[PDB]
Amino acid sequence: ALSLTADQMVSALLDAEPPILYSEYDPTRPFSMMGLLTNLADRELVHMINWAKRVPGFVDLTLHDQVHLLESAWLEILMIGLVWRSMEHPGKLLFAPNLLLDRNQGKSVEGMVEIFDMLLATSSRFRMMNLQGEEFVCLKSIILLNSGVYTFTLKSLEEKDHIHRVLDKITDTLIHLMAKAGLTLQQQHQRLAQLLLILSHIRHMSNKGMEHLYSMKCKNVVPSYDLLLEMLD
Amino acid sequence: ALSLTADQMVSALLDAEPPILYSEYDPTRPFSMMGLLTNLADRELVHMINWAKRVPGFVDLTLHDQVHLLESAWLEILMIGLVWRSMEHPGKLLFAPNLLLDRNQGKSVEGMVEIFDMLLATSSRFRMMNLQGEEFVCLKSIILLNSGVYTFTLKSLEEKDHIHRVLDKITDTLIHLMAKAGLTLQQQHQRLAQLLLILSHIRHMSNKGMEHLYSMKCKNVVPSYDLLLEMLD
Ligand SMILES: Cc1cc2c(cc1O)CCN(CC(C)C)[C@@H]2c1ccc(/C=C/C(=O)O)cc1
Ligand SMILES: Cc1cc2c(cc1O)CCN(CC(C)C)[C@@H]2c1ccc(/C=C/C(=O)O)cc1
């Protein structure tokens, strides 16, 4: 992983991309929104595990540290994927190609419209920046490696060092993408910062979302350490 | 603000720095922790308002947008200040020079030790990076301008554009600081990214902290829109 070139980092990430899934509802029947969203998210998580194992550097970590990173990052990763898919659909969130919802549809569940609105504003920001696919895959990998790295022994010190080295490679890769597209050195640093600052907002959204999910007080909601460990092991 | 040089941006920020306050308890009497922490934080907020009015670009915004940004960012700003003050005190949090607490002292309040631990790990990270004073003031200004900019009319479009232009100036300023200290171009971009990614974790902490404060269910806890508007107006 640490010997990959920038172009090789980009190809590895593009090749690891998970598929876009569909909502499971009978389209011949009349139009539970949270049920549909939960079932979709549960299926996405399985693909998320397979993706994570393909991000360079990730399978070099201990299984316990892989679980901790996914546990910290899984809702941020679902959210950045949602916002990316929704970028060319102003005013709507493309949960799936058969489940395109507006903010009015969000008002059906108490507390959801506020989350819908933050996600729509994020998609708006990505549109304004003209975010590219190759930049998006870099940012999603940065979420995976960064979100849990501050919340974890000699082995732990070695693991954190490695994670920071991999993050440095992804930064190099972003900058290389921006240099390729012709931006100046000033423009490169400015855009790097613009991109990474949106990650702060994605964290914020994930925390507001997790508050919603925990408030459900339900064993079939939020993947456990043990479920994540079973799927990763 | 947008015509400031990098050196002028740095001096303006260093000159705007608020003072380090002391805890109000009688030091001759025997050793409520949350009472002491709340009273300190309430006094810090008043200085925070005066600081914010001195960050270049901030008073160019509407009063309502100034309130919204402070409302989003005030706990992150208290937290980054705490972690900076604690950097040369391994294992301790320097809430004030007369109130230096360890994680064991945090266990006295339900849910607090988890927050204490995240703040201590952040201070540890800043130590590992050897964060400098001039970098710290840049990052605190970036929190102020970025935390609320995704959650806000023609005026609103003009305000968001301005905020992003000011953020771009602070990015330039960070990079200039790093070039001055002798780092290579690679090292500059890498360190910029390292710094901005810690801001994601600071957001995370602020959200966990706000959950604690809201759970108190108390009108004397968390500054209202109206109190912030009164102090800013
Ligand atoms: C399919 C999908 C659902 C959601 C998001 C992105 C997605 O790609 C982000 C917004 N979020 C809504 C937000 C309020 C969390 C939903 C959602 C809904 C339910 C669950 C539940 C999972 C579980 O119980 O295991 C997770 C995400
Ligand atoms: C003085 C100070 C207190 C705290 C932090 C940083 C500080 O500089 C961050 C950790 N946080 C503790 C965290 C659990 C919020 C405390 C704290 C405690 C109480 C309040 C209450 C304010 C109010 O009621 O208006 C705010 C911050």
Give the CATH number of the domain where residue B221 resides. 1.10.565.10
DSSP SS3 for A31: coil
CA A103 to chain centre: 21
Residue A61, CA distances (Å) to A47, A87, A102, A152 in order: 19, 33, 40, 13
Beta-bridged to residue A96, according to DSSP, are A99
Residue B61, CA distances (Å) to A10, A25, A198, B122, B157 in order: 39, 47, 21, 31, 12
Ligand 1 pocket: which of A20, A78, A215, A226 to mutate (most atoms within 8 A of CB): A78
Length of chain A: 233
Nearest CA to B111 out of B216, B203, B217 is that of: B216
Is the separation of the CB atoms in A94 and A159 below 8 Å? no
Is the separation of the CB atoms in A23 and A189 below 8 Å? no
Residue A221 contacts by C-beta under 8 Å, 6 or more apart in sequence? A38, A213
CA angle A120, A126, A131 (to 5 degrees): 150
Is the distance from the beta carbon of residue A212 to the nearest atom of ligand 1 less than 6 Å?
yes
Nearest CA to B4 out of B55, B52, B61 is that of: B55
3-state DSSP percent of chain B in helix, strand and coil, to 5: 70, 5, 30
Distance CA B214, CA A127 (A): 34
Is the separation of the CB atoms in A198 and B167 below 8 Å? no
Nearest CA to A78 out of A113, A111, A42 is that of: A42
Distance CA A89, CA A102 (A): 10
Given the DSSP bridges, would you call strands B92-96 and B99-102 parallel, antiparallel or unpaired? antiparallel
Residue A27 contacts by C-beta under 8 Å, 6 or more apart in sequence? A98
Distance CA B32, CA B48 (A): 24
Residue B62 contacts by C-beta under 8 Å, 6 or more apart in sequence? B155, B159
B44 is known to lie in a ligand binding site? yes
A142 contacts chain B (CB < 8 A): yes
Distance CA A11, CA B213 (A): 45
Q: Is B164's CB within 8 Å of A194's CB?
A: yes
Ligand 1 pocket: which of A37, A83, A206 to mutate (most atoms within 8 A of CB): A37
In chain A, the number of structural domains is 1
Residue B110 contacts by C-beta under 8 Å, 6 or more apart in sequence? none
Residue A217 — left, alpha, or beta (φ > 0 → left; ψ -120 to 50 → alpha)? left
Q: Fill in the DSSP letter of residue A100.
A: E
Backbone torsions φ then ψ of A54, nearest 5 degrees: -95, -5
- Exposure on the CB side of residue B122, measured as CA atoms within 13 A: 30
Chain A, residues 174-213, CB within 8 A of chain B, namely 175, 185-186, 188-190, 192-194, 196-201, 203-204, 207-208, 211
Range of the domain at A68: 1-233
Q: Where are any strands of DSSP class E within chain B? A: 92-96, 99-102
The binding-site residues of ligand 2, defined as CB within 6 angstroms of any ligand atom, are B 37-38, 40-42, 44, 78-79, 81-82, 95, 115, 209, 212-213, 221-223
Is the separation of the CB atoms in A187 and B184 below 8 Å? no
Is the separation of the CB atoms in A69 and A144 below 8 Å? yes
Q: Whose CA is nearest to atom 20 of ligand 1?
A: A38
The one-letter amino acid code at B178 reads M
For residues A45, A225, B210, B30, the Cα torsion angle rounded to the nearest 10 degrees is -170
DSSP SS3 for B182: coil
Residue B84 contacts by C-beta under 8 Å, 6 or more apart in sequence? B126, B131, B136
Question: How many CB atoms are closer than 10 A to CB B98?
Answer: 13
Question: How many CB atoms are closer than 10 A to CB B205?
Answer: 24
Q: Where are any strands of DSSP class E within A4-146? A: 92-96, 99-102
In A, which residues are within 8 Å of B171 by CB distance? 189-190, 193
Decide: residue B215, CB within 10 A, 0-12 exposed, 13-18 middle, 19+ buried.
Answer: exposed
Is the distance from the beta carbon of residue A115 to the nearest atom of ligand 1 less than 6 Å?
yes
Distance CA A12, CA B174 (A): 31
Is the separation of the CB atoms in B123 and B93 below 8 Å? yes
Beta-bridged to residue B92, according to DSSP, are B102
Is the separation of the CB atoms in A157 and B102 below 8 Å? no
Resolution in Å, one decimal, please.
1.7
Closest ligand to C-alpha of residue A212 is 1
CA B156 to chain centre: 24
Supply B187's token pair. 């090292």
For residues A59, A63, A68, A72, the Cα torsion angle rounded to the nearest 10 degrees is 40
Is the separation of the CB atoms in B165 and B2 below 8 Å? yes
Is the separation of the CB atoms in B223 and B45 below 8 Å? yes
B85 is known to lie in a ligand binding site? yes
Distance CA B152, CA B179 (A): 35
> How far away is chain A from the Cα of B25, in angstroms, using its nearest Cα?
33
Residue A29, CA distances (Å) to A24, A25, A26, B105 in order: 12, 8, 6, 59
Distance CA A64, CA A175 (A): 31
Q: Quickly list DSSP for A153-211.
A: -HHHHHHHHHHHHHHHHHHHHHHHHHHHTT--HHHHHHHHHHHHHHHHHHHHHHHHHHH
B157 contacts chain A (CB < 8 A): no
